[PDB]
Design a protein around this ligand. Structure first.
Ligand code: HEM
Ligand SMILES: CC(=O)[C@H]1CC[C@H]2[C@@H]3CCC4=CC(=O)CC[C@]4(C)[C@H]3CC[C@]12C
Length: 422
């Protein structure tokens, strides 16, 4: 009838913004209002920082050794501290990410030239580009578009997406097809991991994978220290969490610029004044591109990639609203609600980047469980989007459907778009 994110958004008007669903022994709360969600993420962030141990996830994360589906704990804090710093170093700390992402936007731009004068479907092409970026950032891969090993990775990532899309988080088989995908994935990375452990300079540099292995190098004894399996799982997750979210956010951006050609022209003016028409845009231009940033913020608001977050589990007996919340309780954060709440947003259903130009905006979550790839994401999307807008104009050749479909993320239905440069 109606997807859960809209259903509970819709019920929040008449009945409350906190809803309790029952199934089996576990209570499941759904939270559709900013104060409540802030209570879960920030205010009692630590209490609700647990994750649920499903069987798909176990396969995925070799038993909860990743970041996303592991419980808050001494081991998980060191692990994430290790991760967070790794990313910071590659993005803010220097220009390895900038370079990776610029040089990839080249390839992407080049691929698009050749697609003129078609009414191409991009999505594959972008998928490729963001996947390549993450291959680069994690292994120092040097694949070009045609490369078969890159093609392997997209194919096992793709299989995992397809598999999960049909089936379970079981919030609210064929589980063998995942194991298969997972195995080829686990092996290929491990190989890369072996290749990396052999050539390893701690001072620096040269890779997210290096950076974890160093961190794991410094690994006194069991209790709260990361094994090597977490390194591998964290590398796998950089794709798992990073590709489909980033590619989709790009797919929406473009989808919306088709509906708003004027706005696409306005951002293109911004780029022309501020950046050359030759120079590639780089991170230092960010402050000087206020509209673009607005556009990006708006896309992330209006079509949240995960309109319901992965559950937050109640680590101890706690409370929410003024209501007690037993240990083990699952809490679904309704990202669509808080991003479409008319109490907090004027014309929340209209695409208006100007609303970010002049509070309950949490595109990356927040609190202990906040996105660990936020800095990387933001840089990815800035760099990617400035370049194609600088080099290309995207028009309709009937306009794409902006409702959205739920794969493993919320995403627009496949569309054709005319791609035209200068
Ligand atoms: C492109 C747009 C992206 C958005 C909008 C986004 C948003 C989010 C959100 C909303 C969460 C949920 C936190 C929670 O459960 O409360 C999250 C978690 C996460 N994100 Fe992202 N993210 C993006 C890209 C990435 C990328 C590129 C990576 C790369 C490694 C990444 C890694 C993660 C990880 C590991 C978590 C798990 C944190 C737990 O704990 N994300 N992200
Ligand atoms: C909540 C969020 O936006 C991110 C954080 C972790 C991410 C998940 C991590 C596991 C995963 C692996 C994949 O290969 C596909 C997408 C999924 C299913 C990811 C969907 C987006 C998630 C759920």
């Amino acid at each position: 009838n109606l997807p859960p994110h809209l259903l509970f958004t819709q019920l929040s008007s008449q009945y409350g913004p906190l809803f309790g669903l029952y199934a089996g022994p576990h209570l499941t709360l759904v939270v559709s209002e900013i104060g409540l969600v802030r209570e879960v993420l920030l205010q009692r962030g630590r209490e609700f920082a647990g994750r649920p141990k499903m069987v798909t996830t176990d396969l995925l994360t070799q038993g909860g050794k990743d970041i996303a589906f592991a419980d808050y704990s001494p081991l998980w804090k060191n692990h994430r501290r290790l991760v967070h710093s790794s990313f910071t170093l590659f993005g803010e700390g220097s220009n390895k990410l900038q370079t990776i992402v610029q040089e990839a936007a080249d390839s992407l731009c080049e691929e698009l030239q050749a697609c003129r004068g078609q009414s191409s479907d991009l999505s594959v092409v972008l998928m490729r580009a963001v996947t390549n970026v993450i291959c680069r950032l994690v292994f120092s891969s040097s694949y070009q578009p045609s490369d078969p090993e890159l093609q392997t990775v997209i194919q096992y990532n793709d299989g995992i997406v397809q598999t999960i899309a049909r089936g379970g988080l079981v919030d609210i088989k064929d589980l063998k097809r995942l194991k298969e995908c997972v195995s080829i994935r686990d092996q290929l990375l491990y190989k890369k991991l072996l290749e990396h452990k052999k050539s390893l300079t701690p001072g620096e540099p040269r890779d997210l994978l290096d950076a974890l292995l160093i961190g794991q190098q410094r690994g006194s004894g069991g209790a709260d220290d990361i094994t090597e399996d977490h390194v591998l799982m964290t590398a796998a997750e950089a794709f798992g969490a990073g590709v489909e979210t980033t590619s989709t956010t790009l797919l929406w951006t473009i989808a919306f610029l088709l509906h708003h050609p004027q706005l696409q022209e306005r951002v293109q003016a911004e780029l022309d004044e501020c950046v050359g028409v030759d120079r590639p845009p780089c991170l230092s231009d960010r402050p000087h591109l206020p509209l673009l940033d607005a556009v990006l913020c708006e896309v992330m608001r209006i079509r949240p990639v995960s309109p319901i977050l992965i559950p937050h589990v109640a680590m101890q007996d706690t409370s929410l609203g003024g209501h007690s919340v037993p240990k083990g309780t699952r809490v679904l954060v309704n990202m669509w609600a808080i991003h479409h709440d008319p109490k907090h947003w004027d014309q929340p259903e209209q695409f208006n980047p100007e609303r970010f130009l002049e509070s309950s905006f949490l595109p990356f979550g927040a609190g202990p469980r906040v996105c660990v790839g936020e800095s990387l994401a933001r840089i990815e999307l800035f760099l990617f989007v400035s370049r194609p807008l600088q080099r290309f104009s995207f028009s309709c050749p009937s306009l794409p459907d902006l409702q959205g479909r739920f794969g493993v993320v919320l995403q627009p239905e496949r569309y054709t778009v005319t791609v035209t440069p200068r």
